[PDB]
């Protein structure tokens, strides 16, 4: 009766005539329909995404691809802990309130100037979200931004207080990209390809720097009323209590090491998933140092996205273990020659930048970083670059809100009209389409 | 400064000590350090549960034992979903209120007699709390027996609201040794000697039949004068709605399922972790019948208890690997044979029994299920006997409160005095020490 219902019945359909229909090999059948019936339920989200992510191996198994313990072993996968150790971080920072001390103290150092009030704010937005999250930091700025746009509270001088709003949903989705941890889909590509920390930074952090001030300049240069105003810095001040600096010390030392594991662990005995032990470590630290409790841990950690790490997984070992990755890669072979690796890598960008306003982050990429990264690999390249473009490409979402939550926020302060935001993007979009495909290119030998 | 913390330092004091005075192959030193750390970590809770949990396979790594990986693949052992899936079956029945219905349409059936009124309310608590969990079970009961004992309000008439009081506390912890969804002892056993569903049902549903009457009988024939009062049926009623069968349908379903896992998996193609499936099949279905939102799962599932789980059973590996069950097996060997099997079971049985009092119901069983388990099996005895045994006696906690939080949540309804628990537990866990040394005696050929 309910749309979803009926998506999920046309997607059992689908299967079943693709499973009926298709003229290969029989592994390669049950590769591709199970492709299509995943494909489907991730991008229209007619189920949780987490429960899609479920149904990944429990379908694996029935099919005989794998034995049920070695389809749930994706589940436990190195980098779905390096993630929960970052979750974790959050939470103590979160809770002992060090995200409110870092906003203040850096927007208090704008004296009262709405110039520098704004410039602060993304600055901060993007800052934050290198570490905690996007749609808490998003959610946790809005009334941040609200308060010092009330001075300049003439909403019949909107485009003042839209620049400002729509600055920081950019911003946390910006600074999301800077970090393996900060957006699931930077976890999705580490996991797949096997990136480090320091690996994952050595790409994004480049790329959040040069796409921050570039987003900036694409708002402003629409309609900026703001090189006037004043501050109303209302509510009370903030001071370092009970180990706030503990837990910058914690965080400082567990950034350092996730930095210099390179280093580190060769002099040491080479450890095998060392950002990871780093990542557990900053748990038990944590908890020894008493300044984050586990219940706080467990609201804060979204396991759904953790489940869905593994099921990502789950399905690129099902479309090697079918052999799809390598059909695809036969059937792809006359079209990615006869293309430049410039044409597909602009190609790629651009699908993706687009197909991210109207599904999910984290689903886009839990779809289509396995699909690539095997193809690619029966290419015999190093799947590493379309894995890490996708994943970046993955948290470009700039035109309607429900492309992401960030967006969503912001808009429901009930003053963003759909228009605005659907020319900003795409204008940012087509923006970002060269950045990447620009640096993609760069980082090639 | 605080006191966990120097339960913590003296701990690692302890292990440091033993690590370098103990006079052994270097494995075996190292196995037994760890063991008397973790040991202590979660008898005395210093840490979180969860945290020691996670501290298990980090020293595993960094002391060479394991591979991190090869660790953390712990944590996807098949009974950790299984019990996930039962935590989502919990979550819908909860929030669709078919919990409440299953109270009120039984509570209902006794028309205004107390004496026919507790009966059904501890008769209650043990079938719901056979599927749902422990404190989840106990904390919705208190509203509904406190509704009752409000007609013999009369608290210088104790004995008749501490009866039934006493009384739901015992029968949430006896209904959860029903089956392998209740507590979580029951499901480390379960994967420590690689139990199915209606394995540990053929084995602990006897056991709870047993002990409910054997612990209402004691309770009784200490002080009630119960067999008078009168009803008073203050609330809404209940009713059916939007698949509230459906809820049912998917849950008995399910159950069947897991009765008939025997030959219903051995007819259908032998696969791996039948029972897992089942389990995960459940939160499908309850998703595609769209009866529960995942956000419920969410908050419903301890999250805490599936990664102690893990830590659990790597903490079973660790004793393997290193020879530390072999070199226990050694040292108790002598003593062993001196003793019988009656001996032995008895003593373990009354160790648990009233250690259990003193410490978490499952941390206790994350300790003791694999160090017996692992030298069982280096003795070359099926070691489900021990495992069983140790699983069902961590769940007899009948004495003071922090003991369970069914026995704290009943204790802070501010009327049950110290003394009074402290000696009704104490008949029961002898009273239980009988019953389990007798049905582990009858249970061997
Ligand atoms: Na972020
Ligand atoms: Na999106
Ligand atoms: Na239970
Ligand atoms: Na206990």
Same mark, same amino acid.
């Given at each position: 009766?309910?749309?979803?219902?009926?998506?999920?019945?046309?997607?059992?359909?689908?299967?079943?005539?693709?499973?009926?229909?298709?003229?290969?090999?029989?592994?390669?059948?049950?590769?591709?329909?199970?492709?299509?019936?995943?494909?489907?339920?991730?991008?229209?989200?007619?189920?949780?995404?987490?429960?899609?992510?479920?149904?990944?191996?429990?379908?694996?198994?029935?099919?005989?691809?794998?034995?049920?313990?070695?389809?749930?072993?994706?589940?436990?996968?190195?980098?779905?802990?390096?993630?929960?150790?970052?979750?974790?971080?959050?939470?103590?920072?979160?809770?002992?309130?060090?995200?409110?001390?870092?906003?203040?103290?850096?927007?208090?150092?704008?004296?009262?100037?709405?110039?520098?009030?704004?410039?602060?704010?993304?600055?901060?937005?993007?800052?934050?979200?290198?570490?905690?999250?996007?749609?808490?930091?998003?959610?946790?700025?809005?009334?941040?931004?609200?308060?010092?746009?009330?001075?300049?509270?003439?909403?019949?001088?909107?485009?003042?207080?839209?620049?400002?709003?729509?600055?920081?949903?950019?911003?946390?989705?910006?600074?999301?990209?800077?970090?393996?941890?900060?957006?699931?889909?930077?976890?999705?590509?580490?996991?797949?390809?096997?990136?480090?920390?320091?690996?994952?930074?050595?790409?994004?952090?480049?790329?959040?720097?040069?796409?921050?001030?570039?987003?900036?300049?694409?708002?402003?240069?629409?309609?900026?009323?703001?090189?006037?105003?004043?501050?109303?810095?209302?509510?009370?001040?903030?001071?370092?209590?009970?180990?706030? $600096? *503990?837990? #910058?010390?914690?965080?400082?030392?567990? !950034? &350092? +090491?996730?930095? %210099?594991? @390179?280093?580190?662990?060769? =002099?040491?005995?080479?450890?095998?998933?060392?950002?990871?032990?780093?990542?557990?470590?900053?748990?038990?630290?944590?908890?020894?140092?008493?300044?984050?409790?586990?219940?706080?841990?467990?609201?804060?950690?979204?396991?759904?996205?953790?489940?869905?790490?593994?099921?990502?997984?789950?399905?690129?070992?099902?479309?090697?273990?079918?052999?799809?990755?390598?059909?695809?890669?036969?059937?792809?072979?006359?079209?990615?020659?006869?293309?430049?690796?410039? $044409? *597909?890598? #602009?190609?790629?960008?651009?699908?993706? !930048? &687009? +197909?991210?306003? %109207?599904? @999910?982050?984290?689903?886009? =990429?839990?779809?289509?970083?396995?699909?690539?990264?095997?193809?690619?690999?029966?290419?015999?390249?190093?799947?590493?670059?379309?894995?890490?473009?996708?994943?970046?490409?993955?948290?470009?979402?700039?035109?309607?809100?429900?492309?992401?939550?960030?967006?969503?926020?912001?808009?429901?302060?009930?003053?963003?009209?759909?228009?605005?935001?659907?020319?900003?993007?795409?204008?940012?979009?087509?923006?970002?389409?060269?950045?990447?495909?620009?640096?993609?290119?760069?980082?090639?030998?």
């Amino acid at each position: 009766l309910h749309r979803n219902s009926l998506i999920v019945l046309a997607d059992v359909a689908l299967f079943l005539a693709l499973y009926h229909f298709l003229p290969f090999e029989h592994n390669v059948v049950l590769g591709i329909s199970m492709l299509a019936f995943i494909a489907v339920l991730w991008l229209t989200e007619a189920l949780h995404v987490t429960v899609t992510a479920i149904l990944v191996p429990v379908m694996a198994v029935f099919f005989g691809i794998f034995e049920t313990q070695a389809a749930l072993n994706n589940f436990a996968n190195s980098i779905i802990f390096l993630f929960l150790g970052g979750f974790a971080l959050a939470a103590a920072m979160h809770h002992q309130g060090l995200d409110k001390v870092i906003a203040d103290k850096v927007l208090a150092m704008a004296q009262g100037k709405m110039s520098v009030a704004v410039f602060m704010l993304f600055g901060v937005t993007a800052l934050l979200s290198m570490w905690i999250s996007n749609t808490a930091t998003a959610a946790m700025m809005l009334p941040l931004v609200l308060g010092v746009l009330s001075k300049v509270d003439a909403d019949k001088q909107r485009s003042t207080y839209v620049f400002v709003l729509l600055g920081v949903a950019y911003s946390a989705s910006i600074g999301g990209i800077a970090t393996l941890v900060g957006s699931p889909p930077n976890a999705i590509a580490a996991a797949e390809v096997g990136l480090s920390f320091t690996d994952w930074m050595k790409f994004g952090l480049p790329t959040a720097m040069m796409m921050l001030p570039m987003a900036i300049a694409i708002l402003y240069f629409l309609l900026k009323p703001t090189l006037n105003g004043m501050f109303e810095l209302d509510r009370a001040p903030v001071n370092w209590d009970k180990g706030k $600096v *503990v837990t #910058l010390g914690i965080f400082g030392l567990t !950034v &350092f +090491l996730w930095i %210099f594991s @390179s280093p580190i662990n060769a =002099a040491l005995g080479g450890f095998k998933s060392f950002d990871t032990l780093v990542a557990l470590g900053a748990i038990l630290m944590l908890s020894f140092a008493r300044v984050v409790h586990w219940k706080e841990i467990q609201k804060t950690a979204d396991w759904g996205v953790l489940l869905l790490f593994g099921g990502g997984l789950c399905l690129s070992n099902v479309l090697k273990q079918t052999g799809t990755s390598v059909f695809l890669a036969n059937a792809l072979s006359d079209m990615v020659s006869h293309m430049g690796i410039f $044409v *597909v890598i #602009l190609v790629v960008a651009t699908f993706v !930048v &687009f +197909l991210t306003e %109207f599904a @999910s982050n984290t689903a886009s =990429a839990a779809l289509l970083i396995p699909v690539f990264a095997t193809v690619a690999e029966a290419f015999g390249m190093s799947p590493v670059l379309l894995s890490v473009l996708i994943a970046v490409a993955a948290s470009c979402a700039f035109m309607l809100p429900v492309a992401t939550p960030p967006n969503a926020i912001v808009f429901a302060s009930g003053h963003i009209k759909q228009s605005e935001m659907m020319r900003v993007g795409l204008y940012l979009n087509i923006a970002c389409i060269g950045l990447l495909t620009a640096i993609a290119m760069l980082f090639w030998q």
